[PDB]
Ligand binder design. Structure first.
Ligand SMILES: NCCCC[C@H](NC(=O)[C@@H]1Cc2ccccc2CN1C(=O)CCC(=O)c1ccccc1)C(=O)NCC(c1ccccc1)c1ccccc1
Length: 290
């Protein structure tokens, strides 16, 4: 019962603070961006969509906190709705970070082949593609997610009724599409950005390099701890390890803590991609004056 009590005494407050801070940060980013009368640049649009995704993901948190505390008490319909929202927004966030990195790489590395004389380079096509792909990936949540009434704990939670092979397949898709592909795209793009910036000439390059390194390190540190534990759980399930109660409890608590840390990244997104740029701070100041 150690894992259950730890969840009870630790998830409510953490998710409450995440909810407050995410609603106050990503909402502020969204408002600052939507306050713009003129056009919005490519990275501005991607940041807007990222802010919306993070807002929804944090919005669904308190229901999950209640789930951890006592039990699901909203029926299966809200189980399905919340799960779909969660997965859609998580995948959207990952792919939007990858798209932001690719846009930065295109603008800085291939700087002389994409030059434009101050037009709006509309990028809504990729945003629609991202959202459609996220819906396609979340379909299984729409299909399977239900609220089983456990006869072992007498509880009632939002869990999948997949077959075991299905659970492993969904875990593998999570790992591949949410972590590995975004991480590789980010790594390539930002390594090339650094390679270009080290051989550039200016005084603004230093902050750019530091920001790039911080962004990559933040993503890696925040998300690796959870995906590594997910890989350990896959290894256990496929027979690569021996099951026991103590290991089960360790895995459960580790998953809880690592997931908390991971959603802390969607909490921190405003502090890295939005508030550090002079453009966004100027827009924020203008808005607050208004
Ligand atoms: N043993 C019971 C809990 C097993 C799931 C595990 N729950 C947690 O750890 C914490 C703490 C915790 C404690 C005890 C009971 C419940 C929870 C809920 N948690 C949450 O925050 C929400 C998760 C959730 O109910 C959910 C999310 C999406 C769709 C449907 C449901 C977890 O793995 N959650 C994050 C994970 C994931 C969730 C569901 C299915 C597959 C994976 C994830 C999803 C997307 C991106 C990254 C990670």
């Amino acid at each position: 019962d150690f894992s259950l009590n730890f969840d009870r005494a630790f998830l409510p407050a953490l998710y409450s603070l995440l909810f407050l801070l995410g609603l106050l940060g990503n909402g502020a980013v969204a408002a600052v961006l939507l306050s713009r009368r003129t056009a919005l640049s490519s990275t501005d649009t991607f940041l807007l969509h990222l802010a919306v995704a993070d807002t929804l993901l944090v919005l669904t948190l308190p229901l999950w906190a209640v789930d951890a505390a006592v039990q699901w008490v909203f029926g299966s319909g809200l189980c399905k709705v919340a799960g779909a929202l969660f997965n859609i927004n998580f995948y959207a966030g990952a792919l939007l970070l990858a798209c932001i990195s690719f846009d930065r790489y295109l603008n800085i590395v291939h700087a002389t082949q994409l030059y434009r004389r101050g037009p709006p380079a509309r990028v809504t096509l990729t945003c629609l593609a991202v959202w459609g792909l996220c819906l396609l990936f979340a379909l299984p949540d729409f299909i399977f997610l239900s609220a089983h009434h456990d006869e072992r704990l007498n509880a009632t939670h939002c869990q999948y009724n997949f077959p075991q092979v299905g659970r492993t397949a969904l875990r593998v898709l999570q790992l591949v599409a949410g972590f590995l592909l975004p991480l590789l795209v980010m790594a390539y793009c930002y390594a090339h950005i650094l390679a270009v910036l080290l051989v550039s000439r200016g005084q603004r390059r230093l902050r750019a390099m530091r920001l790039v390194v911080v962004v990559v390190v933040a993503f890696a540190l925040c998300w690796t701890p959870y995906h590594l534990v997910v890989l350990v759980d896959i290894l256990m399930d496929l027979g690569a390890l021996a099951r026991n109660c103590g290991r089960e409890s360790r895995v459960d608590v580790a998953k809880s803590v690592t997931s908390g840390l991971g959603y802390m990244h969607c909490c921190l997104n405003p502090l890295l991609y939005a508030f550090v740029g002079v453009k966004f701070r100027e827009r924020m100041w203008m808005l607050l004056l208004r």
